[PDB]
Structures are given as structure tokens and as C-alpha cells.
Amino acid sequence: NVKDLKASQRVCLRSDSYMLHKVLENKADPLVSLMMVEKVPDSTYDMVGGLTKQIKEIKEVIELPVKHPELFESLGIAQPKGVILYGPPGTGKTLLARAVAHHTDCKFIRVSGAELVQKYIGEGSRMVRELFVMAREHAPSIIFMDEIDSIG
Amino acid sequence: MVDESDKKQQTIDEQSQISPEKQTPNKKDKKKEEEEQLSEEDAKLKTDLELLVERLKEDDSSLYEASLNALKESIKNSTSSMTAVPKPLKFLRPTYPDLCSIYDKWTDPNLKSSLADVLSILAMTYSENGKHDSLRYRLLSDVSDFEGWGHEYIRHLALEIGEVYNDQVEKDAEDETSSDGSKSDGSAATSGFEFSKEDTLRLCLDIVPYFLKHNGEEDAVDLLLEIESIDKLPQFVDENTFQRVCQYMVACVPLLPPPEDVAFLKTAYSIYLSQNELTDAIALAVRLGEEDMIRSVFDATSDPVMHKQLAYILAAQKTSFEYEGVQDIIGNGKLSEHFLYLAKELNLTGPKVPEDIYKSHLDNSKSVFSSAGLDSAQQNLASSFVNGFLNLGYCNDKLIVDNDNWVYKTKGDGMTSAVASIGSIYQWNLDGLQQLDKYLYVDEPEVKAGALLGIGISASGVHDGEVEPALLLLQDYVTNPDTKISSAAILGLGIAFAGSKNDEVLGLLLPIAASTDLPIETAAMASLALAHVFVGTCNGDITTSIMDNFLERTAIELKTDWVRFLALALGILYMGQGEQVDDVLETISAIEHPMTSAIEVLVGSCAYTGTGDVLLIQDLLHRLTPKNVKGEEDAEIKSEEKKGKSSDKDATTDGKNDDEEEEKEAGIVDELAYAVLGIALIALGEDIGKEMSLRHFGHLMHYGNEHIRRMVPLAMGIVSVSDPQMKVFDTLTRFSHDADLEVSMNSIFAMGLCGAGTNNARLAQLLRQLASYYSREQDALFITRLAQGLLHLGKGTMTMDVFNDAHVLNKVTLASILTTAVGLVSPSFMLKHHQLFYMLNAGIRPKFILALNDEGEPIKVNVRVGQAVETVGQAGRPKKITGWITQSTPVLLNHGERAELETDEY
Amino acid sequence: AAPYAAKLKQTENDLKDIEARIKEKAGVKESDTGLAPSHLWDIMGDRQRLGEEHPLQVARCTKIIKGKYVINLKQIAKFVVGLGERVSPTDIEEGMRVGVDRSKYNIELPLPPRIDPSVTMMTVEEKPDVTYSDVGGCKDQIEKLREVVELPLLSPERFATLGIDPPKGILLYGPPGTGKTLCARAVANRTDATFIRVIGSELVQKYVGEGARMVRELFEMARTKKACIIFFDEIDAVGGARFDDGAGGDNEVQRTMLELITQLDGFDPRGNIKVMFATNRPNTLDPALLRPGRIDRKVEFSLPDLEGRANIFRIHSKSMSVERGIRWELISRLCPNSTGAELRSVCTEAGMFAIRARRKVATEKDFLKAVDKVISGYKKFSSTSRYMQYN
Amino acid sequence: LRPGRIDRKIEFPPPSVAARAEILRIHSRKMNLTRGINLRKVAEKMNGCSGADVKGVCTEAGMYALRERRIHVTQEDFELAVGKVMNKNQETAISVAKLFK
Amino acid sequence: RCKLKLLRMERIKDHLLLEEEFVSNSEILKPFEKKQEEEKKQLEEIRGNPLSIGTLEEIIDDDHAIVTSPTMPDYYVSILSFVDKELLEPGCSVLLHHKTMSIVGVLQDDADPMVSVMKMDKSPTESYSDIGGLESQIQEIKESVELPLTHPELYEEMGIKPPKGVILYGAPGTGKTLLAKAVANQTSATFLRIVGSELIQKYLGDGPRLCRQIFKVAGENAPSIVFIDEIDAIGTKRYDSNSGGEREIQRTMLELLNQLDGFDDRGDVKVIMATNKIETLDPALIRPGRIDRKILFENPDLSTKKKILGIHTSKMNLSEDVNLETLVTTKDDLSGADIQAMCTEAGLLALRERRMQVTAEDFKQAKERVMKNKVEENLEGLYL
Ligand SMILES: Nc1ncnc2c1ncn2[C@@H]1O[C@H](COP(=O)(O)OP(=O)(O)OP(=O)(O)O)[C@@H](O)[C@H]1O
Ligand SMILES: Nc1ncnc2c1ncn2[C@@H]1O[C@H](COP(=O)(O)OP(=O)(O)OP(=O)(O)O)[C@@H](O)[C@H]1O
Ligand SMILES: Nc1ncnc2c1ncn2[C@@H]1O[C@H](COP(=O)(O)OP(=O)(O)O)[C@@H](O)[C@H]1O
Ligand SMILES: [Mg+2]
Ligand SMILES: [Mg+2]
Ligand SMILES: [Mg+2]
């Protein structure tokens, strides 16, 4: 009935005139589309390890306010915003952000500056609000917007 | 961190982060050898404290917990607590953080249960020494902040909160409670409360009320007085100390039901009397409803001074704020007694000076005329009343009125109510008498009667001091045998005096409202008047009014409408208190018939007032009984049924309104949603029930003083055209009026469409016309608030004639009541030493921010506006005095209040 | 921390939880329109229901064969169809839509041409009713509009007596802020002629060739309408300059530029379409609408004169609540030569100084303050005597 | 780069020589090694400025070992891989000169 | 602290409201009344079972329409016409009957992937005077944006047109972006917010089409506030040069003129623009007479930063070692985003020691790191 039904839920039909039968036991998330076509498996800190310092640096501002936002309320700090990772390519800059995310249980959303990850809106400008809204559906999340600036 | 060995001060802290070598081994072995080493253990106590002090910085639990874990053991294992009983007792000071560190910083069922009990017994016994008090204090103001103590310090104080609360719930109290061990009063825990209170008043305002409410005595509050009275100005300012005192009382309105609440409000009054503002004393004195406290404050200003000064003017201004005029009677008579200055003070207290300042406001505002003159049939009656509704208050539109053409074409009850509409044009003003005189001396007995109605209305702005009161003129007319003459006199008498009481008024309204033997449908007005006289002060709950209600119901039901008015009159009468309305609910319910159940449901609304959340579920339970009875069968009466149903609908709403002002004021917004859903429920539940509930909704909003006056009347209004009873629009517009031509523009525009567009009876057309013209005045000439103004949590008396009219179906008879709309609000203005008719500056702000008050205070940021503005209603209520830059001092504070300004300049 | 603080956190989270609960139990629903004067709708609903009388697969004639027609359904599939009993020999035209029956293909009902219109209907709206007693610019410039646009719509009798081909086109060009749109709104009340208003920048589409279709459809449809005015707004984009590139991407836009030349000139002249073109720069116009043969007398709306500003400020202050005895000439003097829109904001800032001053009127003094505010504004910016360079 | 939206800056430097040895080890944890190979010795042959260079030395050692078709990766393949990957540094874009102004 | 009283009272009335609603719906929302039972009998007689969706192309004035379905086939539909023939119009989604396609009804209320971008996905949790300081020219944004909505009364006394529009400009760090979202809190009018880098697209011609939408949505709410964040980002930003370039920039400016006013004469939209590059715009929008008062903001001076810093440190646990006035003293006329950044970095140093009390050292050392960003964002160091 209408209180077991909500939006974005897949159903099965017996077409007696399109008579709703059951919920479907399958769905493909639209955020998972982006992540699929990218294709990422999980990492930990043995894929970064040997630069032990980096793990500490990012742990303070990224990991903890997902885990306990009560620390940052007591402190009074206004919560962290953008965090720049930069260095030679081959230092596993991407691998550190993967490594935090499995422990924290975030959706590791690697964006790459692509129009190929989408096939459902198909431009990056309109996928800024919406990407946020999907990452809120499936919160917690890490939006790894990897800019490159090779584009054009 | 790691153990490395002690050779400096930094590394001793490191040693004991893993394992103390000074508090654990040493002390323990020592205690179990000889009782001569008790001398040394006292010396080592200070040493143990210092290592705790240093280590309240380690964020995670594990290396503070585990490290002190055997110290927690030493209490019962080696110290024992009975090897001398002074010596183990005085060694409990270091072991007490250790107990909390396994209790709370590790939640484990076996030890958290056990150690709650241990913390209570040893805390109470060791606060006899007074070193347990000091032990909390070094942790209260702590060292450094981290996770651990953010939980720890609440545990220390929770022992105290625990015991006093439990002593009330349980019929066992004392140390028989098994989750404590602390005695209920005694003197071993009494000292713990006294020391704890000093610090927490200084830094917090959190546990301070909690403890008092748990004592439940104005004694407890009077101990608080001693600490605060020093603190009044130097430690924290007068204004801040005031905010504390009103926060307690506002916060503890549900938490102290009426008999408990007034006992606490007596002490809040006393704090205010001692400090600077006697203005806040008066406000709290009205809130109780106590005549006595008012007199004390009048004496406090008057007796030490024999010179006109700000002081005499100040007492008279303070009593003026109550437009109920309970205060106005009290203040008139001490002023005559004192006999220094009669002339300026007696008028100022009375509503006579408020008439004069109105002339100045009216100049800027001007006068709007748009009144209909289009007569011919029923449209004659509509247009003549509409003339008054657009000019309510004190205005002038003389030339249209003296044209007696349209006046005389009215007929029946219309003639009486046509002259009444003329008098409300000159409402709150002594001049205009000449128009009433014409009708009084011409045609049929009906227009004479309507002239009298005008006197009552006009007298609302001049009576107190007993210089031309409504009683003087209208006592004659009651004596006159003609019925129309008597009904008009006593209705207007009731209006003029509102919350004021006097023997001649009271005793006039006494022989009648006791004789129901005579069949008059217009003797409702007899009780209506009596009800107002009582509101505003601790109730008489007069036995006469209950007597006649019962006798009329027995005698007749042939006029269900008369008795229906009478049932409401009791419920309006019983306001002014909530303690006393308990007893009369029991008296009426003794008599039990389905007709008496109707009377009860209204009086239940008033009875539970100011804490009700039980009232609301009960007023839904009444609704189910119709359907319950139907279920049973599946498995003269006309009058009785009708009264049952109508009372219920008015009561459900009336409970919501009454409750929501008195408890806090942020809940006001929520109660609006119930009504919207109530309308939908009532349309599929009963056809007859719908007719009443439409009208009650508009007055739900006006009584409660909602904060959203833009959205809801307009949204209701479109839908309610289809539904029967156009008397709904009239009742929406009493709320909508707010500041005129702010809200009221949308009403005029929307309502003129539905009115012109649809005609479906000339009866229906008349109501729709009346409503638009009410909402507007002339660039916000006056405002209407059902609240007193002084308290916006308080309830007035003048607007209870507005609240009356929605329980009975619409009539030309009802139109006579509806023309009066007293409940006018004064334009806040500065006074000095000569009497000033304007302001200087005000700050305006849409809303408060503060948690401290729910009445709010304006921020010192505001947007600046000039002099000579009428106070503005909800959707913009906060008003500030701006005079600090002009080096002026308010004497009469205003925060969005009705209170008029007086200023002190050196 | 403090003992009561510990409870504030719990009660806050109970609020968060109960809002979602109230929302979920109320439910989400889809609003559906109604009508109270219909309490019976199955007096004519039952006739439309349950048999075949028929809802029609819409088609369109692609070629008349003389004695049947070839239609393209919108399911694209083509059929020869005849004539039923609602249709005659003369009702069917080229490129006209017709409705046909789904069990057997035959012309059931003739229909208005072309289903492509839906964004030529988002440039059609009904007329703005702004008066001709408050207008922009108090010069002789609007009477020149009244001879080209307005009068041959009112009265073609005078132009048959002259014997001249009635005058149709006009350019509104010159400085910014001069109320060119205010006078075509003013004319929209007065003539009672349907107004069609165009944005030239909505005529460009990513897929080039789409806006070519667009223009043709609007203009021929308008010849079928009678007594209308098309206000070509913001056609500095398409209607601007033309030039050729070597690897550019400007050329796609120029397609619509070219289509504007060829519909206006037609292969016959405009069938009672009076055209106003509003260019906000007299420097962006195609050099084949620059020629005056299709744009007849063209009237420059310029910045106010020193007498014209005094008039404009008097309309604004008769409409404003003031104290008379304020000079409106003085106010024109303090100003440099500047837009007509500055004087339109002197009053509203004088109205905000009313509220601080606690007035119902604006008096002499505070207009001086407002005049200074806008003037220092133009000092801070430009286009105080610019034409976008070169009258 | 607006001031207050950047409260953490994580710079990854060019590897240290303790870090650069462990990158070689990370890849080798799937691989078979002939016992006695120190990837710290190889790290002293490297000078590096990115850990991409050392990922190519391991890939090359197992593809030399594939060419041989031995299960173990032999120690001369890690000698050959550094010199092969450094030639590859001079062929993706020159960067080690010492020849400066 | 002791905001308990509020939370209790609000929560309690919500509890009762949940109760009343649940019980109201069940068995006393009577489906046994004749006005409900007799109404659905003859409603369903023409209302489906499946109700084939159409999209409405055009109506004909004979009680007909021509629909094009999203499924494919067009239909020449009639209209049952108890949904009031003149209440629907092109672009609506329509309910057609599954025996023969007649317009049973009309759905109203839609959403698009293009108004998904506009709509709010949050409600601000920082309300007014968290922008406190620089409050001496907040009087031309609380008396043209907030007030005509709050009182139409004062603008009736003067009559003529009310204030429309403000543009905020100054150096960054004058709080413009949150100010826009804070005057929205007060008025309770539908607040849309659109970034200006989404009014630049990498495709051509469809830019003006996106911008044209934004104000039609806003006038539909009778009161709205539209904030364009960075309207200097449509006059500096471009993608590729064959679907962007000068032209893409040029067109969108021209479009926004018609939207701000032009011919449309739409409902009340208050507009808030924050910009600091006010010379990349048409000289047809930055003239007074559209955007009435223009507001200048200057870097906060010595006394103003005293106002600013009490805003940010009320969330902190202050020590008695902390001196707020010496933190103010050193800086000379510098941004208020800097003050916000120093307080954030002060709680980060406090967390580095692990202590949730914030000490004086953390503010005073974080000050110098903030000042190193001014004195080596220009590698000249001390001026040469
Ligand atoms: N001459 C005028 N008199 C009164 N008001 C004016 C005048 N000119 C402009 N305005 C005001 O400016 C507002 C907007 O002007 P409009 O949209 O007509 O621009 P425009 O003059 O066509 O210039 P542009 O082509 O540069 O945009 C109008 O609604 C009007 O209130
Ligand atoms: N003058 C100020 N007073 C108080 N807080 C400020 C001030 N200026 C900026 N802030 C704070 O800085 C943060 C972001 O500022 P916001 O984005 O609102 O400002 P902006 O002026 O548009 O530009 P920028 O973001 O570049 O500083 C918020 O936390 C805001 O409260
Ligand atoms: N720190 C590291 N530890 C182990 N392997 C690494 C490390 N950094 C890089 N790699 C290897 O180098 C490869 C390329 O690194 P890449 O992901 O391109 O780095 P970045 O994210 O810094 O651009 C990875 O796929 C991985 O095999
Ligand atoms: Mg790489
Ligand atoms: Mg233009
Ligand atoms: Mg910015």
C-alpha cells in the first residue's frame, strides 16, 4: 500500500492492467552508476604506508567529524571545508583518500572531470547540486572530485 | 605516556599515566600495616590530588580509567570506611574521581549499577566535613577540557538532583530509596546544596532552577535571594538578574501546575520589589492576580515622596497598563487618601488621559471613509453597521452619521444595532454624545435602546475615578421596564468597566442572572457583563451565576439558544485564575444529565488552563462518544443534543488557546496546525459540528496571538465560502486586523472578489461585507491584541466579548453584540513631567533571538524609525526604546510590550 | 560540562525525529484540479466514453493527389486516405494536419496546421495593460511611433486616401535606460492589438538548423493573425554583425540571422505585421535591415533633455505622495545628461528616506540626497554620454 | 585559495629513502622473491622523486622473470629494471640534468 | 544554555499533533458519509484504472485538445470538463482514460533536472548577525529586501514602486554570500539560489534557455528571493571557444536584462546580487533605476573587527589568558573571513594537543600563520 511505497523504489508488475504486485528485490543506485563506470575497489593504509605522517594529517579533519561531530562543537571550530592534496604523481594521493573511506564507511565517489561517468544528466554544471544530494542520500560520503585541468 | 623514570617534573606525570607508583602501591601497603601510618596518609592526600589535577587532559578513557582502577578498590579493601570513621572519611577525597572514571567513562552494566549507589552515600557523609564540597569545585572550574570530565561533573551533581526528585514521587522518601542513601533533608546533605548553589549561580543558570523545583518551597527560593542581592549590579547587571528571575517562572509554568506555580511567583515578585525596577514587580503581581502586592508597590513609591516628581506619575502609569482596570480601581483611592496632588494622578490612572493622546495620533493618521450607503432591503442593515466597522476607535465621520435617512430605514433589531454602530465611531471618547441624544428622543422604543449601547462603548475610555462611568447613566435604564431598554443598558455596562470591579456594578448584575423565571433571550447579556467584572483577579467564582445557569436549564429548553449563551458566560467568568476553577467543575458535575455534560466541557477548558496537555486528549475523547453509542445499538431531545455538540467544538479550541499563551510562547506556532486538521475531521464527522468549528478557527488565531498573520486567514477564506455560515469571515478578520493596511490589504482584495462574485443569499452577502470593513482602519490607527500587552502570556478582558460570538448561529440579534470590538491598544508614547503626546525614537526588530525569555527582548542592533508610531502587532512585535544616544533612561521598560514610555533625563 | 546542558542535546534530537514522523504520516499526494459547478459530468462524459467516436491518430498531408491524399502519421507511417462525411473537397491543404481513424485510415476531422509550435507559443502572451498616460520619455519621439505603428492599425482609411503603401517598420535605437519597452507596453493597452514579444537570444539552439525552423513558423503564423505587433527584443544577438571566420563557431548563430532577412522581405510583403525592433546599441544591426526600405522612419530614443527630465520627474511625483512646493526643474539641473531611469529611482530612494525621517510624504530636501546618490553612481560607472561608441 | 576554506594542506613530497624502499616492498608482497633481496639496497641505487619510478622497477623485474619463466623474481632483474626505468625517465621527458644556467 | 524550556514546549505540542492526526484519519475520516460515498460513485466511472499519461501541446476552444504522448501516438482528445476547461495550458501533464483517451484530469506540480539545480538542499543554520560587524550599511538591505514584504504599509504611504534589487560589492570577506541567505530566513519567502558558473554551459544557445527559466519559477511563488552567487562569473568564465567564447557570455547578459524586468511583468521577485567585478556587465543593469541602491562595503576597521570577533569566539571555550582586544589590535583594515579562519585554526591547534578547551596560545600562534599568507602570497615580502 501507499505507506509501504515511497519514491525511487523498483517494483514488479503483473500486467492485469499494470497491477502492482511486489517490490523488486533489485535496484541500481544512480550514484553507483558513476562509481561503477569509474570502477573502484576498496583500499586501506597498506596501500599508502611508508609515509606514516600523511595518515595522521588527514585523520584530524576528514575522519573525526564523520565519527563524532561533538568534538568540533566543543572546540567551537567552524568545520573544515576544502582540503588540497598535492605532490608528485605517484605518491598515492588518490590512494590516501581511498584508504580513509573504507574505515569511515564513506561512499568513495571518484570524479575525474569526465562526461563519461554520467549518462543520465550529461554535464558537470548541473551535477553539482545533484551530486551533493546523492551523497546525502547515501551519506556518509567522500566526494573525490579529482580535478586535472588538462581539459581544453 | 610511557614509563621512563622520574628525574624531572614532566616525567612524574608520565610515570603515573600508565601506573601511579605513589597513589596505588605506597598508600595501599601503608594502610594495611599500621594505624600509625594514618598520620602520613593525610600528608600524602595532597600529593594524590595533584597527580589527578595534572592528568585531566588525556582525551581517551583507557589510560585514565585503568590507571586509577585499584584506587577505586582501596575504598572497601584497605581504607574500609570504619577503622576510626574520621580518618577513612577524610581520605575519600582522591578516591572520588577514580570511582567516576570506572562508572561513567566505561559503561559496563555490573559496575555502573553498583557505583551509582557508592557515589551517593559517601558524598553526603563527606559533605558534612565540607571538603567534599571543595572537591567538586576544583573539577567544576576544572584544569583543561577533554571528553572525560564533560560527563564526570554531571555525575557529581546528579546525586543531589536524584534524591530530592525521588522524595516527591515516592511515599517513602528518606534513605529508604535504594538508588541513593542520601537522606531527604537532614543537615549532612543540606550543606551540599548550599555550597553547590553559590558557584552554579555565578557561572550557569542550569541546575539553579532544577533544585528549587525539586524542593517545591518558596523557602528554597528565599535562600537564593541572599546570594543574588549582593550580585544584583556588580557581579552581573540588574537587567541580567531580572532575566534570570523571569526565566525560572516561564520555564516552570508546566512544571509547577497552578497551586505550586503561584507559590513560586510570590517569591519572584519579592526579588523584583527589592531591586531597582518596581515596573517588573507590577507585571509579576498582575500575573499572580494578587490585589495585595499591587497595593504594596503603590505605597513604596508614594509614601517616601510628597512632591509631584516622576514618582507619582510613575505609579499611575504602571497601574494604567492593565486595560482590564483591576489595577485602575486599586490606584484610585490611595491617591485620594494621600491628597498631595489629586488632579493629575486620578485621570492618568484612569483611561481618561489615554483619550487625549489619541487625538495626536489621529492627526497623522487621518480618517479613511469608504463606507457603503447602498441601502434597499437587507443591504440597508449591512451598510449601516459597515459604517462603524471602518471607523472603530476614536475617529470622526460626523456628517455621514447626522444624515438620518439610512439610520431610520433599518428595522426591528436592526434599528438598535444601527445606533450602536454609530457609538463605536466615537469609541473611547467622551465627545459625540449629541448623536445618541437625537435617537433617544425620537421614534420607536428600539432606537432609544441603541443610543444606550453607544454610551457603554464610548465609556470604555473614561470611567475609572467615578467621573461619568457607564454605571451612572445606565443604572436608570435597567430600572425601566421595557426589555430592549434593559438589555442594551447592561450589555454596555459590562463592556465599559471590563476587568474593573465596583459594588454598584456588581450588585446591579446580581438580581438578574439569578431570575431565569422570566423568558428573555436577551438576558444573556446580564451574565456576560458579570463574567468580565471578575476576569483579571483571583476569582470570586460567584455562586449566583452557577445557580441561575442550573435553574434556567431545569426550567426551559424551549429556548436552547439562551442557555447556550449562559454556558459560555460561566467559562469566561471563571478566568482570572486556574486554582479555583477546579472546585466548580466538581459542583456542576454533581448534577449529571446529558444536558449538564454540555456545561462541563466548557468549564473543563478553563479548569485545566495553563498546564493542559490532559485537557487536549480529553477534548477528543468527548468526540468519540457519539460513534461509541452507535456501535452499542449495532450489537425536547433536539435542544439537548444540539447544546451537547456545540459546546464540545468551542471547548476543544478554547483549551488550545488558553493553554498556549500561559505555558511559554514558542509553542504558540504548533497549536495552529491542530485546528487545520480539526476542520477536516469535523466535516466528515458531523454536518452540524462543522458550522461551529469554522468560526472557532478564526478566533483560535486571535486569542493565541500566532506569529504568522499573513498566510493562514487568506488560505482559510477561499475554502470557507462554499462551507455554510459566512459568520466565519468576520471571525477571521479579528485576527487579521493586526497593524491596519499591512495584512488587511489582502483580506480586502480577496474578500471583495468572493463577495461580489458570489451572491447566493442576501443573508450570506451581509456577513461577507461586514468582515472586510473590520480589518482596515487608517494607517494602523489602533491594534487589537487579546493578550494584556504587559504580559503577552496573559489574557485581557475586553476581547472576551469578541471571543463570545461563534457558538451560536448568526443573526441580526448577534450583530448587536458584534458591533462592539473594544480591546483597543494604546500607541506607546513618551511622558516626561508635563505629559507628551508623541515618542522620540524606537528600534524595531522582527524577532527576538534570546533563549532567556520567550516574551523576548529586542537586540541592540534594530532598524531605526522615528516618533509617533503605534506599537505594532505580531509578525513584528519587538519594540525597543531608542533614547540612550539622546542620553535618556527608560523608566517603563518596553520590549514589544504595550507599556507606554516615560523617560528620566538629568 | 553542566547538568542541564546534558539534556538539551536529547530534546533537540527528539525534535528532529518527530518532524520526519509528522511528515511521513500525513503522506505525500498529487494535487488534481476540480470544478464545483460540475456535480454531474457523466451527462456528457458517458458520450465521450466506451465506444468509438473517436480519438484520432493525428496525421498531416504531405501531397494532394487530385481525383485522395498522402499523410504521414506521427507514428511515422504513411497512408493514402480519402474523405469521410465531415470533410469536403476543399478542406485539406498542404502541410495541414488532419485527424484520421485508427482502425481504418480516413480523414475524420481537419485540424490546424503544424504540431511543431510549442516554443513559438512561449513568445506569444497576451497584452500588458500599461497606460499611455504614464510612458517613458516626454518628447515628440512617441508620436513618430504613433504614425508608423499605431495609426495604420487604427485607420487604414487615411493611407488609402494618401495612396501610399502603409508604414510598418521602425527601429528603436540609442542610449540605454530610455524606456523603449515602456512605450511598447503603453501601446499594448491602447491599440487593442495582439502583442508577440521576442527574445533574440532564445532563438539560438545547440543543434544548428533548429532556430531556422523556429523563425519561419512564427512569422507566417503572424500573417494569418490580423492586426498584431511583433516586438523584436534583444536581437543584438541574432541581428548583429556578420563576418566570416577560418576555424570559428560564430557561423552557426548566423543561420538565424539570415532567416530574419528572408522572412521579413518574403516573396510578398508582410500581411499586416507592424514590426518594432528594439536595439539597445545602434551599432549592432544587419546591414540588410539597416537599409530603410523595410524599417520605415526610424526614431532614435535618446537621453532626456533638460526640459524633458523635468517633465519625467513630474509624472513620478504626481504619482508619489509629496508636499507640493518642490521644484522639479531644479532637480533636472543638478543632474548631468543621463538616463531616464535615474529619475525613476530618485523617488524610491526618497521614499526610503521617508521612512527614516518618519514621514508619509517626500519633501524638498531628501530628493537632493537621492539625486546625489545616483549621480555619484554614474561617476563610478560609465554610459553617461556613451553610445557604445559612435552615434 | 580564498582564506578560510583551506585549513589543511597535505603536501606529498618526493620520497625519502626509507619511504622509497618500502614502495618496492609493497608491490613485492604478491610476488615471489629469491631470498636475500633487499629493496633497501635498490633504494640506495635509486634517487627518485616519485614513487611511480619504483612501481616500474617492480613491474619490470617480474616481466624479466616472466621472460626467464622462473617462479622467483631474480636479483639481477631488479638491477636491470632500475637502469631500464631510468632510460625511460629520459624518454618520457628529460628531468635530471645538473646542467643549470 | 537553559534553552531547555523551548525544546520541551515545541516538542510537546508536536507529540499531540502527531496523535491528533493519526486518530483523525482512521475511522473518523468517515468513508461512511454520503458526501464521500456518493462522490466516488460516478467519479471512477470515467476515471481509471490505468490513466495513460499525456503531454499537452495545445487546446482547442471547443472542449478539445491535441495531445502528444511521451509513449508515442498523438491523440485528438476531448475533456471530461469537471477539471474546469480554463484551468490548464500547454506544458501540463494530463490524465487520459484507458478505454478512449479523454482528459479525465490534469496533474499540477512538476520537477525537472533543471529546477533540481535551483531548489534548496539545505536550510541555513547560521541566521542573521553571524555576519555581524560592518553593520552600518545593512540598513539598505533591510529596508528594500526584507521590509516591503514585512510591511507593505510604509510603501503604501509613499505609494509608488517599492525597492527592487540590491547589489553587494566590496572586497571579499564582507560576508555577502551568507548575508543573502540570512535575510531570507527572516522574510519566509521562497529562496532560490543559483551559482553563476552554472549559467555558463559548454553548449551554445541553451544557456539563455536555462536563465530564462529561473525567474519564471520565482514569480510563481508570489514572494521569492533569488540569490545569484557571483554574477561576475558569467563575464569571466567560458568553456571551449566554439560553443562558449565571447558570444555565450554576451547572450546571457542580454537575457538577464529581460528577466530582471523587460516586458514580462511577472510577480514579486526580490533580487540579491553579490559581485565584485562590476565592469564586466551590460551598462543596462548596473544603472540605477533597476537595482535601486548599490551598496559599498569596505574592509573592517579596528573597531569593527572587535564586533566580528565576539561573533566567532562565543562558540569557543575561552580561557582567562585569552585577550580578545590584542588579537584585534595588530591587523590594519583586513578581511573578516580572516578572523573566521583564525578561529578555525585555533581549534585545530587545540585539537593537536588534544584538549577541547581553546587556549590563548592557539589563537596567537594561528594569527602568525594567517599573516604569513598575506606576506608570502606576494613573494616580494617587505615591499621592494
Ligand atoms: N524614460 C523613462 N521614464 C520612466 N522610467 C524609465 C524610463 N526609462 C527607463 N525607465 C525605468 O527602467 C526600467 C527598465 O527599462 P527598460 O527595460 O525599458 O530598458 P530599455 O530602455 O529598453 O534599455 P536597454 O535596451 O538598454 O535595456 C523600466 O521599467 C522603467 O521603470
Ligand atoms: N565581516 C565578517 N564578519 C563575520 N564573518 C565573516 C565576515 N566576512 C566573512 N565572514 C565569514 O566567512 C565565511 C564565508 O564568508 P562568505 O562566503 O559569506 O563571504 P563573501 O564575502 O561572499 O566572500 P568570501 O567567501 O570570499 O569571504 C562565513 O563563515 C562568514 O560568516
Ligand atoms: N605510496 C605508494 N605505495 C605503494 N604503491 C604506490 C604508492 N604510490 C603509487 N603507487 C603505485 O603507483 C601507481 C600509480 O600511482 P597514482 O595512483 O598514479 O598516483 P597519484 O594518485 O599520486 O597520481 C599506483 O597504481 C600504485 O601501483
Ligand atoms: Mg599518476
Ligand atoms: Mg538590448
Ligand atoms: Mg566570495
Swiss-Prot record, chain B:
The PC repeat ranges on this chain: 417-449, 450-487, 488-522, 523-563, 566-598, 714-745, 746-780
GO molecular function: enzyme regulator activity; protein-macromolecule adaptor activity
Region described as Disordered: spans on this chain: 1-44, 170-191
Nucleus in keyword set: no
Source organism superkingdom: Eukaryota
Function: Acts as a regulatory subunit of the 26S proteasome which is involved in the ATP-dependent degradation of ubiquitinated proteins.
Miscellaneous information on this protein: Present with 306000 molecules/cell in log phase SD medium.
Protein name: 26S proteasome regulatory subunit RPN1
Top-level taxonomy: Eukaryota, Fungi, Dikarya, Ascomycota, Saccharomycotina
